[PDB]
Design a protein around this nucleic acid. Structure first.
Ligand SMILES: [Mg+2]
Ligand SMILES: [Mg+2]
Ligand SMILES: [Mg+2]
Ligand SMILES: [Mg+2]
Ligand SMILES: [Mn+2]
Ligand SMILES: [Mn+2]
Ligand SMILES: [Mn+2]
Ligand SMILES: [Zn+2]
Ligand SMILES: [Zn+2]
Lengths: 827, 827
RNA sequence: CAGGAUGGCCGAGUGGAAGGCAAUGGACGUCCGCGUGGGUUCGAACCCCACUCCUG
């Protein structure tokens, strides 16, 4: 049998001894020739349907030899084309002959989903009557036939006769609906039995027809078979069993079997029984009928296995990150931008960390990368863990090289020499290549070379020249498949890609939203948790600058919280102030005013609404912009905020799409918002919670949500320290983490309790939410973090004095976390 | 040669006598067998490429015979599929055998446009190297190859030598880049000429390569050709001529010839010159190389012609309305709705006119239409003129029947029996079928039977049963194709379809516009001429009723003109009133107000805007809708309208897409808006007229725009009467016509002068603009007609006492015409 | 899982149209033709593939 060589970074199938050369194969006997051909074609079909690979075969001669015309032709029928160079390339070295196979189709959603078939096959076993002949459907024909089937006469006069006369001329020829057969006196039953499988499916698949056995083909005379040599009852029984053995596949209800009418009719000669003639009328079958199981092969686990009929039909009719597939080009240009003229190392933080920890690693990698002048080298603590494989102790780092004039190379750097290091690297490279094809949807010729390196002081297969990354197009396509592969797993680069995906969704929704600047002056933007409200605000003020040509000091931003102002101020897109400062100072030169988290404002200090109206309505070029963003789900107090009554907040814009949180956190917010809807506070307007998110909107960005309870403060704090340590070891920056507590009066306690448990994890620097830019974990209260967001969030003991306010705290917390959220409730 | 028979409503090719039956064709000489096969395949390819048809061949025997396996296989190769039934159906009677051919590709923009080639071919004459062999590309392979070409070794060490030793075993086999050929023993130069086209194109098309002539294909020995047999220089000249004779096609510049290296090297035997060996190195060619002209055929006018190389490549690499194709389904359901269980006559106006003008026509049609229990019978004065053919005097009407269980039939009615009637009907039916396929994109099997009838006192081909319209699906598909066919011609049904296309475009724009209802209470809608402002107003009243659940009488519509008021009132979607009635009567019961044509309002009677604000913002269910539709290009007076300043008209919506006028009228409006902008009115703010129509927007609906200047008033009115008569004869109801004069005072003068001529055309009654729903022509002034539309508009002497309004009056006139506009300016 | 098919008839021919009952397939010395259609080869009745019918 055929099995995959286990020690390679690719699917390598060894088919054994094969006779190569046209003359040598001709000198063979037909049996040996066809058996070797079937072995090679099984290997080729399996590799085509399993992501490509290599076929290895030993050849009996030492000098170069051509493949052979029959092998050539079988490959041509396999790919349904004369372009062998596109899918098959051959090398030979001494006694070994290699065929390198490319994948037939790549990815879960190929561009050709409804155009080209899912599988290559040796045969589809689907037959249809093609005029006066029965023909087999190739892969394309069977694909179209199944696609059609899955969508939601004079012969009958003879058929009605009870008996036939010997020598009776039938008036019709063989045609699209009729077939004649005559068989020997000795082997009639066996011939009928071997006839059924080839004609009954052909009639069934194409519109039915009549099959007459006992009629001469040339003279159309009825002859039958002598009574002494046929038992009509046995013949009918065998015919029915024969028809019903046929594998039928359905796409409909009811799923009835193949329908037909069968008649064994006496043939009378001069008024006496000469013999019997068999007559079959086959109705049009509602679905596809196979004569036998399709001859298609696939590599699963480690064996070349044939696809069953149902599995074949399923593939032929029918995490995978759809947003990654959509944005692959933007994501690749953001993260894996291929440089001109120099080799890039990514991610830089992890690279610097590694070369600091391990002396001489810089020199090792630099001496190893001398050949490659242009490309990208992608580092990781362990690509095996990145790809959901097991971790191997002793691995310093793994690097993936994607450079010009070279194949992809996956390096494994070892602190000390090890024999199993090569096996680990080979497994990682095989997984990476199989994912780049099957999951990343790469359609070119790809191979990943596994090369182990050691810091302390079976040959690799040589692929054709076409497998080298010729230039920018190939490098960019491979990196765009790597993006899709990474977005299906959890890792540092996967999370960076998720962040950029969230940014792209925010950009799309802002492009939709920003068209309201020409259509409104007063606008009340009602956003939902994680709807990008603040990003939309900032981008709108940039747009106001661009459109009205007014300078930044002439645009005012007003918010409730000092951390949020401080964040907004550094952008330099405005003058940014707090509600109290706005009420106090003078802003008569301001033309445009933008107000954020208005639901958190208060009426005690003054009429901020009226002040904003007075300032804006005075603008020379007509009234200025006055946009008031707010979110009632994120209310933080039980008093009126000075906003106008609900009915008076017009015109409006609703930001209902969650674009700033990963899928787990988004679903968490959607679940929790029902809790607020079930019991809104008395001060909240009656009908302002009727806003609902877009029904089918999803982000397709992976994240982490975890709730741990019954734990003491020490246990919470050690768990936070451990998680931060793991993230930083993997390569996450500290500025991706923020610790949010219930109230400021607990912030000073938790800061000390956190330095206590984090001094054991080798980072002793924190800060409040007023110094976001610093590379350090932010510890602050949930409320003071309003309008801010961090990739990793640790929510500690949500708490408030009044249950009337308690419901909104959990949402106001979870909305701050982009990807990873850890909550520690009381228990 | 092959010629299309002229007396049929379809493409019929008579290929003469052909031997049919496998047993009969096996008795022929191969030469005759192949010639008959070539004739039939030429006919089939021409019909496939020309929209389908019938192949007529006389058969030499009386009894039914199968087509033959060689013919079947050639057809299978032709369509690249075993599904012959999809395209070819055969019927035979007596000594005649017919093959009915379906079109391969249909329509100007097929759905498979980039998936399948447009042409079927007998041979593409494109070859490529496949490892050791040269294969010809079929239609699909050549299509993909041309697409790829269009989108923007040790053998060298043998080629480097200047001589070879007889019997030398070359150290490499035949491969993708190497071919070995021996010299023929009889005609060496002719053999070389024969072989160069076989192998040079294959190398050139894919990667080039080496062709060794004089090398044993099996032993790889060098043999050459004896010096006494060939002249090396003559051989070189002939080879160069053969290579440069190869057809080539380019998708690039420079368009360079085939680049190759040719070496004639001495073959030495024991040191003495034995003969010559020929080596050609073929560099890869930038584009496609043919061995000869492609073997593709098409019907040109009435000759079955072959496509040239460049013409074939042009077809393979690549009025046709687009909106008709887009909306075919809805347009068909609107006009050509196929009813259940009865036969429908359309258009009913024309049907009634015909049966009133002609006695017994009702009996003729009804007695001819007895068999057809369901379908649609589409009437016209002359389908020939509808299809841009020449009219025939004596034709009463033409009816196109599309019924269940029947092929399409085109009926031609004559008053008196005529010999040319059958020819006229046949030509019309042939044109209609060719249009349904090549222009309407029908992909099924279609035939239009031509039948001639008369009031006063060549057999048709019997098509297969698959050409009958089996039910709703086929009837709908054919009628949807007829919609696209009609939309490309000027006719009554074409104009009706254009009207419905404009309605669908306006529905799309309203779907975009209507979501603003949830987001605004006060809104100013600034529409451009022909932007559908009034239609938006009506539909938004409907949506206000729907979404606020208030009774229709609670919604108020206020306009400036009594005709518009009435045209809105009769629809019961709201209460409609004038400004002069609004400012006086009691409207406290009103909740919501929609104001239209606000730019024409006046302040002399009161503060209409203040009253509207007061009524709306006091409403019992909170502040109600107050939307003010206005259009400054359509200003009718130079005074203040009472609208709030431009700076205060917010929130603001703009309707910039012209969706109410055909393409010529729209272009006229767009051009006149430039004059308006050049000289704006003084009573209008500076900024409003800076709203510009969508630059890239087009309607895709045909119409008439004609300016008839220097006419006198009597000539103007005679022309108007004549044009009205032509329209009414063609089938337009009079209520599609509006006659607009400069001002209301000249209404009576122009009306008297109108009747003075119109009473000669057998229509007497006219209608006022206050009775738009009448079945009579509307004569009124441009100002009084604002807000109303009709298909045909006659503009008489557009002028104003103060020329400052002259720019506005032309647009106020043109915007009223949906499809046909006739302007009669002053001398 | 295999095998046959040759000229009017019987039949010899497996890579440079016998014979037997003056010719004795055909198109225009070239080419087609040995069941039909293709392929390889300088060269096919002869080698390879598909198909037709029948036979083990
Ligand atoms: Mg014989
Ligand atoms: Mg023999
Ligand atoms: Mg033959
Ligand atoms: Mg020959
Ligand atoms: Mn048959
Ligand atoms: Mn048969
Ligand atoms: Mn060769
Ligand atoms: Zn079924
Ligand atoms: Zn070119």
């Amino acid at each position: 049998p055929l099995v995959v060589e286990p020690s390679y970074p690719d699917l390598v199938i060894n088919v054994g001894e094969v006779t190569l050369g046209e003359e040598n194969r001709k000198k063979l006997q037909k049996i040996q020739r066809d058996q070797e051909k079937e072995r090679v074609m099984r290997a080729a079909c399996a590799l085509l349907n399993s992501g490509g690979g290599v076929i290895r075969m030993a050849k009996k001669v030492e000098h170069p030899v051509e493949m052979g015309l029959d092998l050539e032709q079988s490959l041509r029928e396999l790919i349904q084309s004369s372009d062998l160079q596109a899918f098959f390339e051959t090398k030979q070295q001494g006694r070994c002959f290699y065929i390198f196979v490319k994948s037939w189709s790549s990815g879960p959603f190929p561009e050709d989903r409804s155009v080209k078939p899912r599988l290559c096959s040796l045969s589809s076993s689907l037959y249809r009557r093609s005029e006066t002949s029965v023909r087999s459907m190739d892969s394309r024909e069977a694909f179209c036939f199944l696609k059609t089937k899955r969508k939601p006469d004079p012969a009958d006069l003879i058929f009605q006769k009870d008996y036939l006369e010997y020598g009776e001329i039938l008036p019709f020829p063989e045609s699209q609906l009729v077939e004649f057969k005559q068989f020997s006196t000795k082997h009639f039953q066996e011939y009928v039995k071997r006839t059924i499988p080839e004609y009954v499916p052909a009639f069934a698949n194409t519109g039915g027809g009549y099959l007459f056995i006992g009629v001469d083909d040339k003279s159309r005379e009825v002859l039958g078979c002598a009574k002494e040599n046929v038992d009509p009852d046995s013949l009918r029984r065998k015919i029915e069993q024969a028809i019903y053995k046929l594998p039928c596949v359905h796409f409909c209800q009811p799923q009835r079997p193949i329908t037909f009418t069968l008649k064994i009719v006496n043939v009378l000669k001069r008024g006496e029984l000469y013999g019997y003639a068999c007559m079959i009328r086959v109705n049009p079958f509602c679905c596809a009928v196979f004569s036998e199981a399709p001859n298609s092969w696939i590599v699963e686990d480690k064996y070349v296995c044939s696809l069953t009929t149902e599995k074949w039909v399923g593939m032929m009719t029918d995490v995978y990150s759809k947003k990654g597939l959509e944005h692959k080009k933007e994501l690749q240009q953001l993260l894996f931008s291929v440089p001109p003229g120099y080799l890039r190392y990514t991610p830089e933080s992890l690279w610097r960390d590694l070369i600091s920890e391990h002396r001489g690693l810089e020199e090792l990698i630099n001496k190893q990368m001398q050949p490659f002048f242009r490309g990208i080298l992608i580092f990781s603590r362990s690509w095996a863990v990145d790809l959901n494989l097991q971790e191997k102790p002793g691995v310093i780092c793994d690097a993936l090289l994607i450079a010009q004039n070279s194949t992809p190379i996956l390096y494994t750097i070892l602190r000390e020499q090890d024999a199993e290091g090569q096996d680990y690297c080979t497994r990682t490279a095989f997984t990476l290549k199989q994912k780049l094809v099957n999951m990343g949807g790469y359609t070119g010729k790809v191979c990943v070379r596994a090369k182990v390196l050691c810091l302390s002081p079976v040959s690799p297969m040589d692929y054709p020249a076409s497998y080298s990354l010729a230039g920018t197009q190939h490098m960019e396509a491979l990196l765009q498949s790597l993006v899709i592969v990474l977005l299906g797993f959890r890792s540092l680069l996967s999370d960076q890609l998720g962040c950029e995906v969230l940014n792209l969704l925010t950009a799309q929704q802002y492009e939709i939203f920003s068209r309201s600047l020409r259509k409104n002056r007063e606008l009340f933007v009602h956003g939902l948790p994680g709807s990008g409200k603040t990003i939309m605000a900032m981008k709108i003020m940039e747009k106001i600058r661009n459109v009205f040509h007014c300078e930044a000091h002439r645009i005012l931003y007003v918010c409730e919280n000092q951390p949020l102002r401080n964040f907004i101020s550094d952008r330099n897109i405005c003058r940014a102030e707090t509600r109290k400062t706005f009420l106090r100072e003078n802003f008569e030169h301001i033309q445009h005013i933008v107000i954020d988290e208005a639901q958190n404002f208060r009426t005690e200090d003054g009429d901020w609404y009226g002040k904003a109206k007075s300032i804006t309505r005075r603008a020379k070029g007509g009234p200025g912009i006055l946009w008031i963003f707010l979110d009632y789900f994120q209310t933080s107090h039980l008093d009126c905020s000075g906003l106008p009554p609900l009915s008076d907040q017009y015109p409006r814009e609703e930001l209902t799409r969650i674009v700033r949180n990963a899928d787990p956190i988004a679903k968490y917010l959607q679940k929790e918002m029902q809790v607020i809807r079930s019991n809104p506070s008395f001060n909240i307007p009656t009908g302002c919670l009727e806003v609902f998110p877009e029904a089918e909107w999803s982000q397709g960005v992976q994240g982490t949500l975890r709730i741990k309870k019954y734990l003491t403060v020490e246990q919470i704090m050690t768990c936070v320290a451990d998680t931060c340590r793991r993230f930083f070891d993997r390569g996450y920056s500290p500025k991706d983490v923020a610790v949010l507590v219930s109230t400021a009066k607990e912030v000073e306690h938790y800061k000390y309790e956190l330095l206590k448990a984090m001094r054991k994890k080798r980072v002793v620097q924190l800060s409040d939410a007023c110094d976001m830019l610093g590379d350090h974990i932010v510890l602050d209260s949930v409320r003071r973090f309003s309008g801010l967001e961090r990739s990793i969030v640790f929510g500690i003991h949500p708490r408030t004095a009044d249950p009337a306010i308690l419901p909104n705290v959990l949402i106001c917390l979870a909305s701050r976390a982009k990807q990873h959220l850890y909550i520690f409730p009381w228990g």
